[PDB]
């Protein structure tokens, strides 16, 4: 018919969208931008006051019975900056339509990495642990128990939850839990923005949002066995302590260090509990039926480990009233009580917290300073999470090519590890 | 007593000035700048005649 010249056309305006950009865990995290000038001199660390607990007395006569003050603190820091980096020759900037889409893809990938870091931090530094011997969906009310006792421990612990509470399922375990959870559903329809954002149910066992995150990591089993505490150790809630010079250095309210008989199988992020040690009500110091659980922050030696919440015994006789106000454990660690390992199987984690337990510390990169003259630098907002990064370009004459860097500096911090919790199904070994 | 977070303060405004150097010899010695374009073609050298005897 009509034989004429052929063309190949690209749709300028229609981009096939792939890869979702949901960040349910990062949006429940709080963002903090400290003053950068002081952050530079403070090694990218700032200390945050913890709300202080007050001892109270009863009666008319309190002669010689006043208490001092005790304010504890936690420290937040940063990590290495995350960034995207690509190069282009001069002739490739004639069209400048793949360049812009690469900038957008970089923004989305950086947000994705932030979300991944938040999820992994939560899994690694979560104190409350709930365990089911079999997989979710076995027995009768495995899912209900699995979610409801997590809520129950976070509730009876009387931890702050005014910002709300969130349960994050991994998708594969929610596939088995939702069958039972949907039948026992109070709340109604979810707003469509929230439903597409990740939250699948609301007000489940009095637990606000129940979400579903595909970035929850897999928690490897602990290989350690036959571990007992070596010597009687009591911990005291202090704000500071002296050093060899005799100077007062701040002490983190979390991060207790204990001495164990052996520290071989255990690695950062496993879950332990001590025999006979129970959680305590935070306001009314009552002995909850649930055994106190800890997650190890790191392993320092073959006999010493650092665990997330300080076990501050109520019956400790040497604690002051100011100190005893912070007791979270019924009794201290005896001479030799067995340490119960709680990572017995490699199970993908379910994470829950009280919102704002995780803090995201962000900082600017002043590459717009006069020290940086050959490079073109501008602010770069990643609005999906809420972190401002940096966008920099610099080309060289010998190749007629330029480099594009999109750097984002942030830190993920678990300021209330006692409020982060990890649910582990099918733990039997 | 009051147990609280400890800070480390640094007073950037107040600087402990320690050294003050004087440079009289370089002020007494004269400064000359021969034309740069001619200096480049020479080996950064000028020749001056000495008083004749």
Curated annotation (Swiss-Prot), chain A:
- Ranges for the region named Binding to the capsid assembly scaffolding protein are 1-55
Site note Essential for binding to the capsid assembly scaffolding protein, residues: 13
User: Which cysteines form disulfides?
Assistant: none
Identification of the protein by name: Major capsid protein
Q: Which GO terms describe its molecular function?
A: identical protein binding
Query: Does the record bear Transmembrane in its keywords?
Result: no
Instruction: Write down the superkingdom of origin.
Output: Viruses
The gene from which this protein is expressed is: 5
Q: What is the effect of changing residue 240 to A?
A: Cold-sensitive phenotype probably due to an assembly defect
Explain what the record says happens when changing residue 244 to A: Slight decrease in phage production
